[PDB]
Amino acid sequence: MSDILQELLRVSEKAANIARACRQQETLFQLFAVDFKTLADVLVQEVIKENMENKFPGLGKKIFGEESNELTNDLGEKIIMRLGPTEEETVALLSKVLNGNKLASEALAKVVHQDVFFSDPALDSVEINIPQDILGIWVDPIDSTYQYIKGSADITPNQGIFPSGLQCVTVLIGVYDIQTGVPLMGVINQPFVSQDLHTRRWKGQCYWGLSYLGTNIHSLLPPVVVISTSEKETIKRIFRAAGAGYKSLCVILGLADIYIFSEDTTFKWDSCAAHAILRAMGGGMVDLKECLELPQLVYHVGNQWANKGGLIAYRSEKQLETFLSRL
């Protein structure tokens, strides 16, 4: 699935562009009423969906996610979010959703139909074929939507870990084995990593991993117990950090050793992408409630798509045994 994965990188960056554009364009920034958040989510999910189907006929039906492909507008009209094929079509659709705001509709249409040529050269070497018929996809188009809307660009991290801020927003695309539920491939895109104070432009960062029939490869990691838990976490060196996607990334990058979440309020789309990448490094994700009585989370079967019993995410099974002993 190296060709699929390479394509997943491109679209994730296209999704990062949309996400950045909605906070940077004058018109888009200012946005039972007009619910821009839902719009931005649905649109990004649909961009990923339409692009993949385009490149790999048949995959479109296999792409599942957090959002629906439908929206209710200001008049109570239900709009099926189908973009294209031309940019003109996309403007008509978005102005149905936005009451007739032509400036905001055009601005969004531009970024949506914008060509992206993002390619990791290390992945161009790799040639792995995975049968298309065994793949499912879980998308979280913009994770940590609270942090995305608040838009704090100014936060200092505690020991490399951002407690909140635009850094906590991730685009999450995960690929799993339909028959076995096991995650196979993952892409995480942080659209908001570094901001230049003088130009105000954001640079982002992309992470990938693949774990297929014993072949394990991942993106090059920048260098530089620790436990990250959510803002709302109430279970008895610990850091608060917003974002389900982002806390997972902390474990991937080695900024935290353990990410524990005790509630039932994360879902398959929150964890799939990161679980695949953790798998490719020798880690994974276990059901928290089960350990308190090493069984990995699965992605094919419904309970409905909540990770019931919570989770522990780990990079090292050694660290996991260490932590599970303490507790």
Query: Is 102 among the annotated ligand-binding positions?
Result: no
Q: 273 near 176, Cβ under 8 Å?
A: no
Sequence-distant (6+) residues with CB within 8 A of 36 are: 22
- Cβ burial 49-77 (10 Å sphere, 16+ → b, else e): bbbbeeebeebeebbbbbbeeebebeeee
Q: 8 near 122, Cβ under 8 Å?
A: no
Return the DSSP state at 280: T
Indicate which residue of 140, 170, 252, 266 is catalytic: 140
Whichever of 148 and 208 has its CB closer to Gd ion, that residue is 148
Positions of chain breaks in the chain, given as the residue before each break (C to N > 2.5 Å):
31, 224, 236, 293, 303
Return the DSSP state at 214: T
Our answer to whether residue 41 is catalytic in this structure is yes
CB of 67 to Gd ion, least distance (A): 6
Whichever of 140 and 257 has its CB closer to Gd ion, that residue is 140
Our answer to whether residue 145 is catalytic in this structure is yes
CB of 146 to Gd ion, least distance (A): 10
CB of 37 to Gd ion, least distance (A): 7
Whichever of 55 and 308 has its CB closer to Gd ion, that residue is 308
Site for Gd ion, rule CB under 5 A: 41, 140, 143, 270
Query: Is 244 among the annotated ligand-binding positions?
Result: yes
Whichever of 2 and 230 has its CB closer to Gd ion, that residue is 230
In angstroms, the first-to-last Cα distance of the chain is 39
Our answer to whether residue 140 is catalytic in this structure is yes
Known binding-site residue numbers: 41, 66-67, 140, 142-145, 230, 232, 243-244, 247, 265, 270
Known binding-site residue numbers for Li(+): 41, 67
Known binding-site residue numbers for Mg(2+): 66, 140, 142, 270
The catalytic residues are 41, 66, 140, 142-143, 145, 270
